[PDB]
Design a protein around this ligand. Structure first.
Ligand SMILES: CC[C@H](C)[C@H]1O[C@]2(CC[C@@H]1C)C[C@@H]1C[C@@H](C/C=C(\C)[C@@H](O[C@H]3C[C@H](OC)[C@@H](O[C@H]4C[C@H](OC)[C@@H](O)[C@H](C)O4)[C@H](C)O3)[C@@H](C)/C=C/C=C3\CO[C@@H]4[C@H](O)C(C)=C[C@@H](C(=O)O1)[C@]34O)O2
Ligand SMILES: CC[C@H](C)[C@H]1O[C@]2(CC[C@@H]1C)C[C@@H]1C[C@@H](C/C=C(\C)[C@@H](O[C@H]3C[C@H](OC)[C@@H](O[C@H]4C[C@H](OC)[C@@H](O)[C@H](C)O4)[C@H](C)O3)[C@@H](C)/C=C/C=C3\CO[C@@H]4[C@H](O)C(C)=C[C@@H](C(=O)O1)[C@]34O)O2
Ligand SMILES: CC[C@H](C)[C@H]1O[C@]2(CC[C@@H]1C)C[C@@H]1C[C@@H](C/C=C(\C)[C@@H](O[C@H]3C[C@H](OC)[C@@H](O[C@H]4C[C@H](OC)[C@@H](O)[C@H](C)O4)[C@H](C)O3)[C@@H](C)/C=C/C=C3\CO[C@@H]4[C@H](O)C(C)=C[C@@H](C(=O)O1)[C@]34O)O2
Ligand SMILES: CC[C@H](C)[C@H]1O[C@]2(CC[C@@H]1C)C[C@@H]1C[C@@H](C/C=C(\C)[C@@H](O[C@H]3C[C@H](OC)[C@@H](O[C@H]4C[C@H](OC)[C@@H](O)[C@H](C)O4)[C@H](C)O3)[C@@H](C)/C=C/C=C3\CO[C@@H]4[C@H](O)C(C)=C[C@@H](C(=O)O1)[C@]34O)O2
Ligand SMILES: CC[C@H](C)[C@H]1O[C@]2(CC[C@@H]1C)C[C@@H]1C[C@@H](C/C=C(\C)[C@@H](O[C@H]3C[C@H](OC)[C@@H](O[C@H]4C[C@H](OC)[C@@H](O)[C@H](C)O4)[C@H](C)O3)[C@@H](C)/C=C/C=C3\CO[C@@H]4[C@H](O)C(C)=C[C@@H](C(=O)O1)[C@]34O)O2
Lengths: 264, 264, 264, 264, 264
């Protein structure tokens, strides 16, 4: 098959090259460029088949259907990568502003490690002991702090006190002025050798400027987390479309091997 | 319709792909690249129709008119994205320097949440109570501070005092030297245990350098606001042209379905 | 005119699209990309006219002359944008190193607000009063400080003292040690309660490191001014060529409307 | 050989140009752009050979196979450069997340200076003296610190103490409170002239903010090391494929010079 | 000459456009993009000449030789710009790691101002006085500091002391403890009014963190010097190839004007 080895083989190769675009990180600035070349290569080989196809009036050759399916996968791949830029900015005038989908996306992003589907939800250790039970710590519906861990749960309790123990220690523990744990024990006359405890009020003003500089850097780290939160929502879309297009790509290959004996 | 399923179908798909360019944020550096490919793909199919069209002398086929309208939408899409770069820089030698349009653009940008048109101006809660009334706070024509809020109104009063209460507290409240609210009560002999209140004049000099570093970082945050202000003015242009070109795109599709029975 | 409404029309549109390149800021990194597409689109339509033109031996059709003029404007537009990168770097091994043209460019850049040509030099307020007179302040040929203003003249006197009043106050004003203006009045025994005026020599060392960090940030702001100075010299080149190419573009359009009745 | 000097010559030149892509650093953002042009040029020359090849039904000319090998080398070069972006991000949702290959890659990266293969493992100084012997310092399997050196071994012991001598000096050396080496010799009454050793508790708070700013900058240097660690793993892939494709390129060239006498 | 004014003219124009690539700074990120378009435009015109050239078996027209020289100049221009990226990173796994050429390149870079060739070495002031003589200061082969100047020689002596006078003042000048030049004159009892000279040991710890932050910024300035050092080595390559290709371009133009009367 001269036409089956120079025109059908590139059809699956072009679609297969688009699958790599769905396995790349959302932070890649050159990802959109790669997807453009895939669509460009399809048009180069599409013109050759146009001349072969007879110029009829209402009889559309079945070869055009195969190219349409391939173009949709390649065309949608570029659009999918373009949508990634919206998440990185989410501008009020344009982007993924509606939050009704962000909550759903966040749950899907956290399902990558433990998918709710039977593929991973059921294929995992299971027992009737306390390892799979529930308690007050696990159920945070009543404003219960999550179990401390190294994944970021400790930081949410300490750093993100939210007018809590970190900022305002409402519980009267009696440690600041009732214990010698690096603090005076109700010692109201603890002077700095006859001078006020603070050697210079100017130091407090310097701390405000220094703290603001440190606070601005802290916001930069938090800004990256916000960008990372949108980054995760951008990679799942590529992964979600990778599986959806995988079935379509397989179907197209099957159709070619199944329709050739009847037409070709 | 052999030519209708291979040449007319991409005509509306190419114009539809340009609509996504109008829904992207102005901060996307690769937005211009996406629009270039849309125009490039139109030229590939335009050459094929040229051979089909008879080489006449003064009889212009109606098919060329459709391509002109399609190219205008695609061509203007790239131009619109190019204009976005002007707002991000607004260089004195080139860009949107004239401010007579900036004021109008600012009002339009703020209308996204509450459009002045009947679509959103009239479709909203309305009552004759004080919720829809006016007072001194709402009317800021007489240099009246706006109602404090979390949207940035509090910062304009406190941080942006403009030689006001923050910088020069003209009102004689008698708190700095007439109250014990973290300040002496007319205590001119409040010495630091016999020493001057300031332990070292060098600390003040350090504060000036530290404050300048913090001030420079503050200007960077304000610079982003200026860029954000121009960013909003850039996204509205894309959104404004999206609706304008939507009607034209629909008209072109209607014309094809209405002119084919008479010509095709 | 089948070929006049399909081939001649894009000829002036392609040249008009290059005019937008000359109205963009010099800081746009994607400006060069836009100019490339303009030249690429001209080649697509150029090949079509090649077949139409008879393959003669020494008879060059007049249509080729129009394409040469159009390509020069489009070709020079890309080169002009390429030259912009040289100003942003001005590397010793390559760029606009010779300063004999920088001085002339600086004067031209400052003429944008008040052009020396009669278009703006003569069209402006004029009177015989002191508003248009000259004095010592205006004439800075004898090392006279310019009149203080908010455009940056005050900063050149204060911040850029250059071993002047800011750094070395040569005039014996008798204020530091002869007035109570935030300084001792010749009080050589003004001790810090029996201790040296400086509470710790280590604070001076910290100031040097803090000052260096602040000084480095100051140089970054000055570096932007140097880039801005080259940025202005880059935008004038685009603006200068915009007017020059505007006349050529008009001439080409006139020639087509004037040569067609004799040839076409 | 009219077709050998116009079509066969560029075949090896196109593949040779792809070798430079594998010799570029992984931090180059324009590396992917260079590889795109190489594939684009191959397609331009491939269309010319299509017309020459007779349009048979099932007799595929052997020239097609030669182009397939060249396309694989050029096609895979772009894919290899695309994979580099995955290492720079290694996002959890996409990239080189599995660490089972990272350990192997790290060993390969360190083999560049001293390859385990006989080419460099055997071609090097060898002796039976202590220079090639092993001891406790060389064998770090029992948590033995590596021999201090300037390659980064000293920093791993001092800076990266990991609750060791740098942080918690468990060994009772008796130097802090038992020696005059810039510390008191069990002097519990060493007061600051009657005042506490610390002149102001506010200084400790300032150090925490200053230390955090310095610590954040330290993490930036460590972040570059992590990026450099992935950078090394990205360059070896280019180098690893450079040798593999070199043999294939040589084979393709030999085939042309060996098959031409039988076919051409 | 119908083909001489339509096909030969762009041949020299395409090669001339590549000369601008060799006059651009090495820091231009879009320099590689410009060179790609030059090669792309050559292929458009190359295909047209292919049809004109008769399809012979072993008779290669001389027109192909002219295109080969043009393609080499244009092809090498892109490669030269690609090599620039290698110098900016010089990764151990890829780049200009061998230093045997860096020393030679450094000497060539410094020859731009005063070329060793007779063009500039001989065309310059020359006299037998001490201006062109040599002394100990000029000859630094015996670890002699170079004459201090504003070109960067003073900083190498003071800032880059290398355990010298800046760090360890070995010469016993007797100024720190033997002169009143801002230091005690052997005054071992110079206390801070009865207190230790240092008011707080915590200030020393703060200086270490502040110094590290300043030191890191100093390394960034030194990092740019390393990049600038590689930048100079990258611009000379472009300049070196500019002169080499200038002769070849002139030869190609001469050949066309010399071979046309015999062939054309
Ligand atoms: C695995 C294929 C994918 C697409 C891979 O292709 C690559 C790598 C990338 C993909 C992963 C590239 C590809 C070559 C393939 C490897 C294949 C071959 C070298 C040859 O074919 C094989 C398989 C083929 O049977 C599928 C088989 O025919 C038999 C069995 C069939 O019954 C199942 C039967 O009907 C048939 C009658 O007899 C055949 C004998 O032998 C070779 C024939 C294919 C060459 C294809 C290239 C030649 O010019 C083309 C052009 O330049 C283009 C644009 C892409 C090239 C390409 O795409 O080249 C190209 O189309 O690898
Ligand atoms: C919603 C359509 C848009 C264009 C979508 O297109 C895509 C996705 C993107 C758009 C959202 C891509 C498109 C396919 C379409 C889906 C359509 C089909 C698979 C087929 O058509 C449908 C609809 C069509 O009736 C509009 C209908 O005809 C009937 C009803 C008509 O009366 C209303 C009547 O007159 C007519 C006589 O009988 C038909 C039977 O069935 C299929 C025929 C279309 C194939 C088109 C592709 C084939 O090679 C082309 C080439 O490669 C190119 C450059 C783009 C491709 C494409 O553009 O492919 C391509 O042109 O989806
Ligand atoms: C204002 C024109 C500029 C170029 C603008 O063009 C755009 C916007 C961009 C520019 C600012 C794009 C352009 C359409 C125009 C608007 C014009 C029309 C829709 C029609 O034309 C008008 C004007 C024309 O008279 C100049 C007039 O003819 C009359 C008067 C003449 O005497 C002065 C006389 O001699 C003549 C015999 O009868 C005509 C009847 O009606 C429409 C007919 C033009 C179609 C455009 C062409 C179709 O495919 C061409 C090309 O393959 C491509 C890539 C794009 C098209 C285009 O270029 O589309 C294209 O070239 O707007
Ligand atoms: C200085 C030339 C360089 C290439 C410059 O070209 C540009 C600017 C860039 C370069 C610096 C661009 C160029 C135009 C030139 C300026 C030249 C003209 C407007 C005309 O030509 C002149 C010179 C020519 O004699 C060299 C002369 O012929 C005479 C003397 C010859 O004896 C020496 C003799 O043999 C001959 C028989 O009669 C001629 C009469 O008059 C104009 C006629 C040239 C048209 C240009 C061509 C038209 O489409 C071509 C190509 O498809 C394309 C893409 C661009 C065009 C171009 O290349 O346009 C193109 O190739 O400027
Ligand atoms: C080292 C070659 C590589 C490809 C280098 O090519 C470059 C530089 C880049 C590579 C490193 C580019 C190349 C030219 C070559 C230098 C070669 C020549 C100027 C000529 O050829 C040589 C070698 C050739 O023998 C291999 C030899 O034939 C002999 C010996 C053969 O027996 C071994 C025997 O069978 C045969 C019958 O008689 C020949 C006489 O003399 C010249 C003839 C080739 C020119 C080719 C160019 C001309 O238009 C072409 C077009 O534009 C294209 C797309 C690429 C060009 C190119 O590719 O140009 C081009 O195809 O250098």
């Amino acid at each position: 098959l001269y036409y089956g080895l120079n025109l059908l083989i590139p059809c699956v190769l072009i679609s297969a090259l688009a699958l790599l675009v769905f396995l790349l990180p959302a932070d890649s600035g050159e990802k959109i460029s790669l997807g453009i070349t895939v669509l460009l290569s399809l048009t180069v080989f599409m013109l050759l088949v146009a001349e072969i196809m007879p110029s009829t009036s209402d009889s559309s050759p079945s070869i055009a259907q195969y190219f349409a399916s391939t173009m949709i996968i390649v065309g949608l791949s570029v659009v999918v990568t373009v949508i990634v830029l919206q998440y990185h900015h989410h501008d009020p005038d344009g982007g993924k502003m509606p939050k009704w989908t962000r909550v759903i996306l966040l749950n899907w992003c956290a399902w990558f490690l433990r998918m709710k589907r039977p593929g991973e939800d059921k294929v995992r250790p299971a027992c009737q002991h306390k390892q799979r039970r529930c308690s007050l710590a696990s159920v945070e519906m009543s404003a219960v702090a999550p179990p401390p861990a190294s994944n970021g749960n400790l930081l949410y309790i300490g750093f993100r006190g939210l007018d809590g123990v970190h900022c305002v220690p409402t519980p009267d523990s009696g440690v600041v002025c009732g214990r010698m744990a690096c603090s005076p024990t109700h010692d109201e006359h603890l002077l700095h050798g006859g001078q006020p405890p603070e050697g210079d009020p100017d130091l407090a003003k310097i701390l405000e400027e220094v703290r603001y500089i440190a606070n601005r850097f802290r916001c930069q780290d938090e800004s990256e987390a916000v960008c990372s939160e949108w980054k995760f929502a951008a990679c799942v879309v590529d992964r979600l479309c990778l599986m959806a297009f995988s079935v379509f790509t397989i179907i197209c290959t099957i159709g070619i091997l199944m329709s050739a004996p009847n037409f070709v």
